[PDB]
Structures are given as structure tokens and as C-alpha cells.
Amino acid sequence: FYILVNNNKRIGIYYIKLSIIIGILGIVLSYIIRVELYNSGNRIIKYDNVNYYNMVITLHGLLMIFYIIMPGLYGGIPLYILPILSVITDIVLPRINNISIIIVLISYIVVINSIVIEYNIGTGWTLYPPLSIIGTVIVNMILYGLIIIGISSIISAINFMNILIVIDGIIYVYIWSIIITSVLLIISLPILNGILLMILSDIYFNSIYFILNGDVVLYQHLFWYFGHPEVYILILPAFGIISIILSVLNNKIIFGMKSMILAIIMISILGSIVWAHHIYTVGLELDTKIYFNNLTLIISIPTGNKIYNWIILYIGSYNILYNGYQSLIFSIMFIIIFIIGGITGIIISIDIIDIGLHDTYYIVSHFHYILSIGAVISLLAGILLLKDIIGYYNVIIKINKYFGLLLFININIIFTPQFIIGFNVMPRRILEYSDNIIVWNLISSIGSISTILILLSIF
Amino acid sequence: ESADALFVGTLDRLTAEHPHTDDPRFAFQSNQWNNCELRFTQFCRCTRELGEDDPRCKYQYYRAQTVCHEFLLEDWMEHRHRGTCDLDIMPDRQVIHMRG
Amino acid sequence: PPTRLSTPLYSEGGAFTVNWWRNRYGLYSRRQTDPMLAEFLFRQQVKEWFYDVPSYNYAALVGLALGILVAVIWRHFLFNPDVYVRRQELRKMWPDRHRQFAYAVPYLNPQLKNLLLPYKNSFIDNEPDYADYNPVGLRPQRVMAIRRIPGFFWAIPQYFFEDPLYTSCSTKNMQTIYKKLGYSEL
Amino acid sequence: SPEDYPTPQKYLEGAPIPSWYSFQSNLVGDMDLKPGMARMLEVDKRLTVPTRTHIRFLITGADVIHSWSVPSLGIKCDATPGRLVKINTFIQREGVFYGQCSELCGTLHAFMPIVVEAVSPEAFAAHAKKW
Amino acid sequence: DIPWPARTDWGGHDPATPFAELMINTHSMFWPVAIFIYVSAIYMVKK
Amino acid sequence: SIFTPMDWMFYYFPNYSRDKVALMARQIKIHFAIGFALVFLVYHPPYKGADYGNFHKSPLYWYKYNQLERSGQLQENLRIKRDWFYDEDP
Amino acid sequence: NLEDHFDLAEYMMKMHNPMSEYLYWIAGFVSGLHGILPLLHSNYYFSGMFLPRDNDNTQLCDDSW
Amino acid sequence: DFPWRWGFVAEKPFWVGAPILVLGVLCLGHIIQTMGQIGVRPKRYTPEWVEATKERERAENT
Numbered sequence A: 001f002y003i004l005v006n007n008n009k010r011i012g013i014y015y016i017k018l019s020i021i022i023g024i025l026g027i028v029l030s031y032i033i034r035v036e037l038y039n040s041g042n043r044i045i046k047y048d049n050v051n052y053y054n055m056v057i058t059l060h061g062l063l064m065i066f067y068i069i070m071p072g073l074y075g076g077i078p079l080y081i082l083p084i085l086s087v088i089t090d091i092v093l094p095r096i097n098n099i100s101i102i103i104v105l106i107s108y109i110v111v112i113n114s115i116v117i118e119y120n121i122g123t124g125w126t127l128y129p130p131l132s133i134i135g136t137v138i139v140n141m142i143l144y145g146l147i148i149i150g151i152s153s154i155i156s157a158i159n160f161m162n163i164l165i166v167i168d169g170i171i172y173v174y175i176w177s178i179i180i181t182s183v184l185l186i187i188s189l190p191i192l193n194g195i196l197l198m199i200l201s202d203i204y205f206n207s208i209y210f211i212l213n214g215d216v217v218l219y220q221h222l223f224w225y226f227g228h229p230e231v232y233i234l235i236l237p238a239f240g241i242i243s244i245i246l247s248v249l250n251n252k253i254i255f256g257m258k259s260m261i262l263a264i265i266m267i268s269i270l271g272s273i274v275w276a277h278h279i280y281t282v283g284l285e286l287d288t289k290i291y292f293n294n295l296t297l298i299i300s301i302p303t304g305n306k307i308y309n310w311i312i313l314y315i316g317s318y319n320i321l322y323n324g325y326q327s328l329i330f331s332i333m334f335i336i337i338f339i340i341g342g343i344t345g346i347i348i349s350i351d352i353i354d355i356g357l358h359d360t361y362y363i364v365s366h367f368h369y370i371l372s373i374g375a376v377i378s379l380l381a382g383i384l385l386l387k388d389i390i391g392y393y394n395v396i397i398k399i400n401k402y403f404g405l406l407l408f409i410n411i412n413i414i415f416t417p418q419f420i421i422g423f424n425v426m427p428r429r430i431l432e433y434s435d436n437i438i439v440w441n442l443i444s445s446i447g448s449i450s451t452i453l454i455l456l457s458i459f
Numbered sequence B: 001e002s003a004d005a006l007f008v009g010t011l012d013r014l015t016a017e018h019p020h021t022d023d024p025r026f027a028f029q030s031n032q033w034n035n036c037e038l039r040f041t042q043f044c045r046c047t048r049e050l051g052e053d054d055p056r057c058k059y060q061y062y063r064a065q066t067v068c069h070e071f072l073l074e075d076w077m078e079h080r081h082r083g084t085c086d087l088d089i090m091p092d093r094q095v096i097h098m099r100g
Numbered sequence C: 001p002p003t004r005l006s007t008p009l010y011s012e013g014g015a016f017t018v019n020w021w022r023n024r025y026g027l028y029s030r031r032q033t034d035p036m037l038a039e040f041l042f043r044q045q046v047k048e049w050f051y052d053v054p055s056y057n058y059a060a061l062v063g064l065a066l067g068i069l070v071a072v073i074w075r076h077f078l079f080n081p082d083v084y085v086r087r088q089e090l091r092k093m094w095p096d097r098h099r100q101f102a103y104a105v106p107y108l109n110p111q112l113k114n115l116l117l118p119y120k121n122s123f124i125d126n127e128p129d130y131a132d133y134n135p136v137g138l139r140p141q142r143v144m145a146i147r148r149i150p151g152f153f154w155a156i157p158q159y160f161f162e163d164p165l166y167t168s169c170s171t172k173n174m175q176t177i178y179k180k181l182g183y184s185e186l
Numbered sequence D: 001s002p003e004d005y006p007t008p009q010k011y012l013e014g015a016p017i018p019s020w021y022s023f024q025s026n027l028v029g030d031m032d033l034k035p036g037m038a039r040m041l042e043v044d045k046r047l048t049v050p051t052r053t054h055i056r057f058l059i060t061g062a063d064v065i066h067s068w069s070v071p072s073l074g075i076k077c078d079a080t081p082g083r084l085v086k087i088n089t090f091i092q093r094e095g096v097f098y099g100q101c102s103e104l105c106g107t108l109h110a111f112m113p114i115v116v117e118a119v120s121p122e123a124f125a126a127h128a129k130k131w
Numbered sequence E: 001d002i003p004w005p006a007r008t009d010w011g012g013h014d015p016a017t018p019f020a021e022l023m024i025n026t027h028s029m030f031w032p033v034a035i036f037i038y039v040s041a042i043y044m045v046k047k
Numbered sequence F: 001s002i003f004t005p006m007d008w009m010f011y012y013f014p015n016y017s018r019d020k021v022a023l024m025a026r027q028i029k030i031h032f033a034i035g036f037a038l039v040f041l042v043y044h045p046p047y048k049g050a051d052y053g054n055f056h057k058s059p060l061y062w063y064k065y066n067q068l069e070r071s072g073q074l075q076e077n078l079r080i081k082r083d084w085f086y087d088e089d090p
Numbered sequence G: 001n002l003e004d005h006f007d008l009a010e011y012m013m014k015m016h017n018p019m020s021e022y023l024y025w026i027a028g029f030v031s032g033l034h035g036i037l038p039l040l041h042s043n044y045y046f047s048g049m050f051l052p053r054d055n056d057n058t059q060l061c062d063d064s065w
Numbered sequence H: 001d002f003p004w005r006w007g008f009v010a011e012k013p014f015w016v017g018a019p020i021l022v023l024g025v026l027c028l029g030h031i032i033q034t035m036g037q038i039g040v041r042p043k044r045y046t047p048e049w050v051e052a053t054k055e056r057e058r059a060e061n062t
């Protein structure tokens, strides 16, 4: 059978397969955005169809976060190796594992169908009210997709937590990475569901939470109380992969295993209490701002310890071993790239700097360097390491120095200029802009078309 | 005359002599919504005691404008004229202490 | 860390000790099925996590972060004029909330705000004292600091008396220049 | 009592109490642009303010969350419904400072720019007296 | 005041308020620390 | 122990460190109390820290101040360099 | 059985029918079309053209083409 | 074991091919993005409009 299979390794393959498929839609949307932003004027979207651009950016964000990177790094690699790393025959909950992937596909079909049938409008992937609650039915459909996705995420989290009860070996760092992400999901998702239900109540049940005398800033608190834990639910599995690859390929035992583990635990606790750095410009109280700014800067400490522990893993490794394997290059590239993204995160963490840089393309470049570059490369590196175990073929990736170089160069051509226009300043979530920002926007656009072309050479 | 005369008498006086400065009761927060509602309630209570024509109540309206945007005031001023403004209901017709 | 089960482990008395940890570590464990095996696994975990020097650094960081967190929560509830848990004042119109207005000025003047505001001259080149004077009296009058903020402010001289242009950029000299032109009052 | 409603003595003696003036600022359309206007940033009514003066900006949003951003003045305040956020500023040099809405607000989020022109206090007084 | 073509404007440009100057200098103050953090770490990415 | 390598704590204070579980608990408690105290003893205290006539002037402040005072640099530094806006056009 | 030892044995042993690969690529291609086709449809619905001409929402020179 | 395209590319030295490929991909991207704007001449980029902006900047001391 195909759909009935409960094999945990087969389901892991399904997650990667579906992430690539849905990923095609994600990348296409990204190409639309960059094409439009190539100059000033209308290029591929009419001025009377500006609502489509708002929908393109909204769906891009939602799909890449919840339907591509999360299903790939928390559903794909985890479901394939975690039961093996735990020296257990199979996953604890076989039937739940099957329904989770089916749920993801069904929620994807709902979203894309809503593109085709509903009027196309957008409110960002952060679905801020009151804009989200005064929209058309496409917003209702997107809400159903998120809630359905939430069901799959929570049940998958329950599945991984049960490994503690059955693990027959040692909890390796990677296993710790997934367990903590599962804990972060169990604690953050129920809050998200509540606020999403309130968005529905105002959309569909004549509720009045997001109209005057009701505080719209309330949504942002509950949303981001899940929002930021989400960005670490998306990065922590990547960290777990990086640890395995560096140790295996360099033939070096992980250094400071317990510090790696305790760094992951620390990032989670801290990541659960820093959400309001996304709400700096709303007008929060001075002491609140100072608390959140202080705790946000603390997250660098545990995150920094992991980075340096990775570096010493690559240091001192034997020279005779060939170092041009794509998996090793990607793992090393992750350290180089993640530091850029994190440092810019610390810059935006200072609220006074953030006043200038909120809702600008500097924020875009910041989270792209971590996700669009770092997380993607980590997932690629992990799949590449498991090529023999997974068994896929008909691609030229394993040893392809051209692909790695071209990808690194062109991805930086896209997002490095977006840091510059952040002090120009070019707001986010816009399509038209002043003529004096064309140069940098044009350079980034040339980078986007080039990256897409390099994706064709792998076949 | 006294240097601390503004603080003496009321905390209200401070913004009455300096209309475009922070009110002592709300300077800790950037959000000034509560400040607007207090100022409007004070305009509502002035008219009940002195009438609309009194220069004092006219100035209490200017003070309310200093912190309240026009779109809010126009709406709240219509509710007041009808007799549905909850900040102006006479105290003996309030329901706040009923059924709980 | 002993390597023989015959050699006992020292424990203090209290609610977080080696004995306290042993009693609870294997409560949910299917692997500690007999004394010998249970002790071996217990010492294995203790050796790995509590005899690891770098692990203690994270213990410090969690304590510091949590202590700040608990205190900021408590401070809002106890002192912030805008946080209401009692209802007496919420059953009255805004002009009548005198007990809650009492928190306003004390909360507007925390110690660190008074201590660190004078150091704005380490971030502003022109008129760093533009907002120092205020005739109302809700806050103290501000005097510019005599030294740069300790740390990464190497771009400015360690002490402002060393800087040649500092005095000519003050809001007082700027006011003099513009008042001589009739340009503005401030 | 009358004294529970503090009012300056000048107004009690018959001085005119100040009024307020409201105006709407809209983007200049592409077909209405003039040879020298900056596309995507020009407006039909600018906000004139005096320089070397402390100004309190109270910012709110009527319908959805906008954001009033003027990068040159170091201001980025969210215009959120229900919150009247206070922003204090002190302009030091004359000029025209251009900004854009910084919170996705709907279809035309990219078409509501923020233009503030700072002039000398004597110039501002003359402008305010005429407009 | 207004964006200008092909400008890095690293940390901001053309401040017209004391607060605007503060923002630019806060970024400039931390920028060398960021470079140190990057250079010091990247130099050791090798066998 | 604050900013302390715990390897040193284990070596120089063997009896205080004998129970490593209890030692870990004290580490957490000590730093918890430090964070709590900072908020309510350094930040919260109302109407304090506004004595700007008592700015600390360290020994290095005076070394550099006297050096410039001895020469004319201190007087020259404090002098207002310009107090006019426009130069006179010949 | 030996045939059942490996998951997806036909593919891993390199005997699978190529149609399975074609369907996977087709499915991805259809997913991509969900971003392009509604763009064209929406453009025509609100303008009457499937795609704009660069800078046709702005003033153009007489000889512009 | 590889198709012609990879056999051709993988035969050359990496630092001979890589630099040429990098430039080629970038050039192609620009070409693709220029095909839809051949002959487009917005009025705001003409010399007359360029001068008028300079006048505005002088008046506003931008």
C-alpha cells in the first residue's frame, strides 16, 4: 500500500517528499515577490490587483514555515532516524504517525484551493487583527489550515515524547533536540489555538474582542507567545542535525555533550519568555521593554556556547579525509551563516535600534539568513548524510562543489542587500517603492532568478 | 502663586496650566487612552454642575481635545447628547452595583 | 566520583541532595529493576550531569533569568499604577481613582532611571541635554554625566572634560547662538 | 465646585479658548505627479511643524493597525486602535522628512506616505495663521 | 530626510532629532563588537 | 559562586562541594536571589539615585584632570569655540 | 521474503516504473501553478490584461514602447 | 555513470569552471529580467524630471 503504511521510515520519506512539493509553491511565490520588486512600477501584478501581492507574501510565509521547513526538519528527518537512534524497533504510536502526514496534506489542499476559489487578499502571515477579521473568506480558510496543522504538530510532539519511555540506549544530543522542540510545542500550541479561536469568533461569531474597548495588542501577545517559540521549534532540530554531521564526518566525539544538551534546554526556557521583542513599537511600558530586551540578549549565551562547541568539532580533523562532500560543506556553511543571522538578531534586539529597523527589510534578511539559508541547508545536509540509508538517487548532489558555491554566493546576493535597504529605509510587505531604492532591490532580484536556475542543475 | 501651587488643590491643575505636557497620573505609560477618558469624564461632570456656556467647561473641553483624537470625541459626544454615554449617566441611574 | 558501589556517596540533608535525588530519580524508571542495577544507573546519571563542570554555568544562567522574571512580574502587580487586581477603583470613574493615582509618581521615578539618564551624553553629539530642564517637577532635573558609559564607548573620550567640542555643542550654547539671531526661544 | 475644574485665569476673564484644525493627507497619484515630485512619497497636504520646539505626537489608528514612521526624526510608532501613544520629538534642522506606513494595513499599505516639513518658528506661525 | 541611490547608510542617515542621533550611535557602538564576534569565530572554521 | 570556574570550587573547597547535587541547588538559589535583588534594590527604589552633585570621580578622573589643569588644555577644552551662527563675508 | 526486506524495494533495487517519478514531478508542477494561474486570472479580472507592461501604471514618454 | 552535461562540467578544473559559471548565471538572470522592459521609458527618469528633483532638493535642503 501507499496511504495505509504505518512504517515510521516510510512516513519520514513522505514528509520530505511533501515538503519539496509544497516547497515548489513556496519558491514560486518568492520568485513573484522578487520579480515585482525588481524596479519601481508594476511588473507582473496590476495596480488594481495589489491584493494578490498581499496574498502572495502571506502564503509564502505561512507555507514555508508550517508546511515546508517544519514538516521537513521536525517531521521528515525525525521520523526516519529517531527510532533508530533510540535503538527501538519502530515509533511508539504507529497509527498516530500515519494520520499526522495525511493531516498535513489535507490542510495544504485546503489552503491552495482557497487561492483558486476565494478572493485573493492578504494580511501577513502574522494575521494581525483588525485587518485579519475584516477580510474575506480566504482568511477563514487559512485559519482552518492552521488549526488543522496544529493538530498534526501536537500529536507528533506526543509521539516523540513517548520515546523517553521506550529508549533502549543513550539519549543523544539530536534526540534531546527533538524532545525539547516537542515540549515547546506542547506548551505553545494550546495558547495559539485559543487566540486563533478568538480570531474566528470575531470573523464568524460576531465577537467584539478586536474592536474598540477590546485591545488588539492582546492578539499580538498571545500570537507571539507562540510565534517566537516557533522560530526555535524550527531551528533546534537543525542544531541537532549539525551536531551529528560534524561528529560523524570528522570522526570526533561531541565535545561538551552535556553543555550542548543544557544549551538546548536553556534556549527553550528563554525562548518561552522573550516573545514581546516582536512588540517593541506598540508602546509597552518602559520596564516591560527593559525586561524583554534584557532576556532577549541572554539567549545569545547558550546559543554562543553551541557555536563554539561545533567549531572545535571541525578543528583538528584528519586532513586525508576528503572535505568536499556536500553534507560537510553545508554543515560548515551553517555555522558561518547562522552567526550572521544571530548577530543581526542581537542588533534588532536593542529596542532603540529596533524602532528604526522594525517592519523593514533588515528584519527580512535577518530571518532569511537563519531559515531560508541556515535551516534549508541544515535539512539538505541531514538528508545528504542519510543518502545511503534513505536510498534515493537520480540526483547529482552528494559531491557537487558547483552547487554549494553557486547557492552560497547567490543566496547572499539576495539577502545581504536587504540589510542595506533596512537603513534606506524600505518598509516590508510593500510592492511599490521610491526610485532611489531600485539598485539594491534590483541586485537582490538578480540573485533570486539565479538561485532558481541552480536548483535545476541537481537533476 | 506658591511654587507647588499646581500640585496643591488637585493633580488636575498641572495639565490645566500646561495643557500639552504629561499628566502626573498617566506619565508612566506611553498609552494615553485612559488619560483621554478621564478628561472627557471631567468635561461631562463640569457641564452637569456649571452648564455648557461656562468658560470653565469650555476649557475642560479644550483640555479633552488635547489628548483625545477628534474621531473618538465626535462619537463620544453624540452618545453624550443622546443620553447613552456611560461616563455621563447620573450616578443614581447607574447599574454598576446591581446583580453584582 | 567513586567507581565501586561499595563506597557510599556523601549526601547533605535537605530537599536537594544526593539522597533526595536518589529517592525520586527512579520513580518513573523501568530500567532500575534491582538494587545493583539501580545504583549503577543512578551514579551514571549523577556522574554525567552533576560532576560536569560546565553544566554549573547554565545553572547560574537559569537562576539569574528566572529571578529577574519572577521579580518583574511581582513588581508590575504590586506597584504598576495600571495593573488592577482589587476592584474598588475599577468600580469608579477615572477622576475618582485616588488610591490608584498614588502609585503614579513613585512608579515614574525608579532608581535606575535617575542613575542612568545623566549618561545620555555618551549617545548624543549635539545638545545631549536638550531635555534636561523641566519646570513642572514630576521628575528630577537632569545633570549630564562627567564620564562615558563604561564598556564599548571608545569613540568618545573617557571623560568629557577631555573633549574639545563638548561645551560648544550644549543646548545652552546652541540656545545662545539661535537667540542672538532671533530664530527661536530654545 | 467651580474650582474642581481648573481653568487659567485668562480664559475666565474672556480670552478665546483655542480651537483645533484637522486635515487629510493623501498620496499623490501616479497620473497627478509633477515633474519634480518624489514617487510613492509625495502627499497633497504636508504636516508643517516648528523646529527647535518640543512637540508631543499622539498617534492612534481608527480602523486597522497602521504605523507612523519618519526615519529622519527617529519615530516609528504603531497607530493601534484603542491606544493613543505619546511620542515626544525635538527637531534640530529644517527640511522635509519622508516616511511610509510601517504596518500592513490592507490593499494600499504602500500608498499612504508620511511627509513632515520642519520650518523656522517664525515661518510656522505665519503658515498656521494662514492655513 | 529621503532615501538616496546606492547608499549603504549603515546604522542610519541624516538624523534631525537628538533621539535620531542616539539611534545611529547605538548601532555604531555595537558594530565593532559584532565584527569581533564574527571574525574571532570564523577564523577558527578550518581543519 | 559568581563568575567562578567550578573546577576551582571543586579543588579548593572539597568539603563544601562533596554533595554535588546540593552544590547545584545552591548555584541556582544564589543566582536567583541575585536577580531578584537587582530588580527590587537597584531598579525599583523610588526617588533615589538623583544626587548628581555626588557623581563619583575616580582616581583616574583626577589624574587626567590635574594633568590637563596643569597645562592650558583644560581651560582651552572648556572654552566655547563658537557662539555665533554666520561668519562675516568680506 | 527477500523482496519484502527493503522498504520500497522496487525503487531501491532500481526496477520501479518511471511513471511514479513523473507523477511526483507533475504534482510539484501543479503545486507551482497555484501561484501563477490565479495571478493571471486576478490581473485580467480587475484590469482586463493577464500581465502588465512594465511601468504602465506611471506616466510614460511619447515614444515609450 | 553521469549524463553528458555533468561529464563535461566535472572534467574541467573547479576554479576554471566555477568563476565562469558564477558570472554566466548572474548575466542570464539580468537578461531574463530585462526582456520585459525593452523600450520602457518612464517620464520620471527624463532629464527634465531629473532637474526638477534637484530643484526640490535645493529648496528643501535634502
Ligand SMILES: CCCCCCCCCCCCCCCCCC(=O)OC[C@H](COP(=O)([O-])OCC(O)COP(=O)([O-])OC[C@@H](COC(=O)CCCCCCCCCCCCCCCCC)OC(=O)CCCCCCCCCCCCCCCCC)OC(=O)CCCCCCCCCCCCCCCCC
Pocket (backbone or CB within 6 Å): A002, A013, A016, A017, A020, A021, A023, A024, A383, A390, A392, A393, A394, A395, A397, A455, A458, A459, G008, G009, G010, G011, G016, G017, G019, G020, G021, G022, G023, G024, G025, G026, G027, G028, G029, G030
Ligand atoms: C525543491 C525542489 C528541488 C529539490 C532538490 C534537492 C532534492 C534532494 C533529494 C531529496 C530526496 C528525498 C527522498 C526521496 C525518496 C524517494 C523514495 C521513492 O522513490 O519512493 C518510491 C515512490 C513510489 O515508487 P514505487 O514503490 O514503484 O510505487 C509504485 C506505486 O505505488 C504503484 O504504481 P502504479 O503505477 O499502480 O501507481 C498508481 C498511479 C497510476 O498512475 C497512472 O495511471 C498515471 C497515468 C498518467 C497520468 C500523468 C499525469 C497527467 C496530467 C494531465 C494534466 C492535464 C492538464 C491539462 C491542462 C489544459 C489547460 C488548457 O498513480 C495514481 O493512481 C495516483 C497518482 C497520484 C499522485 C500524482 C498527482 C499529480 C498531481 C495532481 C494534481 C491535481 C490537482 C487538482 C486540482 C483540482 C481543482 C478543482 O517514488 C515516487 O513516488 C516517485 C518519487 C520520485 C522522486 C524521488 C526523489 C528523487 C530525488 C529528488 C529529485 C528532485 C525532485 C524535485 C521536486 C519535483 C519538482 C517538480
Ligand code: HEA
Pocket (backbone or CB within 6 Å): A126, A231, A232, A234, A235, A277, A278, A296, A297, A299, A300, A301, A303, A304, A305, A307, A338, A339, A341, A342, A343, A345, A346, A348, A349, A350, A354, A357, A358, A359, A363, A367, A370, A371, E037, E041
Ligand atoms: C529560526 C529562525 C530564527 C532564529 C534563530 C531567530 C533568532 C533570534 N531572533 Fe529572530 N526572528 C525570526 C526568526 C528567527 N530569529 C523571524 C522569522 C522574525 C520576524 C517575524 C515577523 O516579524 O514576522 C524574527 C524577528 C526578530 C525580531 C523582530 C525585529 C522587528 O520586529 O523589528 C527580533 C528582535 O528582537 C529578533 C531577535 C532574535 C534574537 C535576538 C535571536 C537569537 O536567537 C540569535 C542568537 C544567536 C547569536 C547571538 C549568534 C550566535 C551566538 C554567538 C556568536 C555568541 C556571541 C554573540 C553575542 C555575545 C551577542 N528576531
Ligand code: HEA
Pocket (backbone or CB within 6 Å): A016, A019, A020, A023, A026, A027, A030, A031, A033, A034, A057, A058, A060, A061, A062, A064, A065, A068, A069, A072, A124, A125, A126, A364, A368, A371, A372, A373, A375, A376, A379, A380, A411, A414, A428, A429, A430, A431, A448, A451, A452
Ligand atoms: C523558512 C521559510 C522561508 C523560506 C525558505 C523563504 C525563502 C525565500 N524567501 Fe521568504 N519569507 C518567509 C519565509 C521564508 N522565505 C517569511 C516567513 C516571510 C515574511 C512573510 C510576510 O511578510 O508576511 C518571508 C518574506 C519574504 C519576502 C518579503 C515579501 C514582503 O513581505 O514584502 C521576500 C522577498 O523579498 C522573500 C523572499 C524569499 C526568497 C527569494 C527565498 C528563497 O527562494 C531563497 C532561495 C532558496 C531556495 C530557493 C531554497 C529553498 C528550498 C526549500 C525551502 C525546500 C527545502 C526542502 C528540503 C530540503 C527537503 N521572503
Ligand SMILES: CCCCCCCC/C=C/CCCCCCCC(=O)OC[C@H](COP(=O)(O)OCCN)OC(=O)CCCCCCC/C=C/CCCCCCCC
Pocket (backbone or CB within 6 Å): C069, C070, C073, C074, C076, C077, C078, C079, C080, C081, C082, C083, C084, C085, C086, C087, C103
Ligand atoms: C484557600 C483558602 C481561600 C483563599 C481565597 C482567596 C480568594 C482570592 C484569590 C485571588 C487571587 C490571588 C491573589 C490574591 C491577592 C490578595 C491581595 C491583593 O488584593 O493584592 C492586590 C495586588 C495589587 O493590587 P492593586 O492595589 O489593585 O494594584 C495596585 C497597583 N499595582 O495584587 C496582588 O498582589 C495579587 C496578584 C498577583 C498574585 C501573584 C503574585 C505576583 C507575582 C507572580 C509571579 C509569577 C511568576 C512565577 C513565580 C514563582 C514563585 C516565586
Ligand code: CUA
Pocket (backbone or CB within 6 Å): D065, D066, D067, D101, D102, D103, D104, D105, D106, D108, D109, D110, D112
Ligand atoms: Cu497603513 Cu499600512
Ligand SMILES: [O-][O-]
Pocket (backbone or CB within 6 Å): A227, A228, A231
Ligand atoms: O523571532 O526571533
Ligand SMILES: [Cu+2]
Pocket (backbone or CB within 6 Å): A227, A228, A231, A274, A275, A277, A278
Ligand atoms: Cu522572536
Ligand SMILES: [K+]
Pocket (backbone or CB within 6 Å): A036, A037, A038, A039, A040, A041, A042, A043, A431, A432, A433
Ligand atoms: K514594483
Ligand SMILES: [Mg+2]
Pocket (backbone or CB within 6 Å): A358, A359, D102, D103
Ligand atoms: Mg510591525
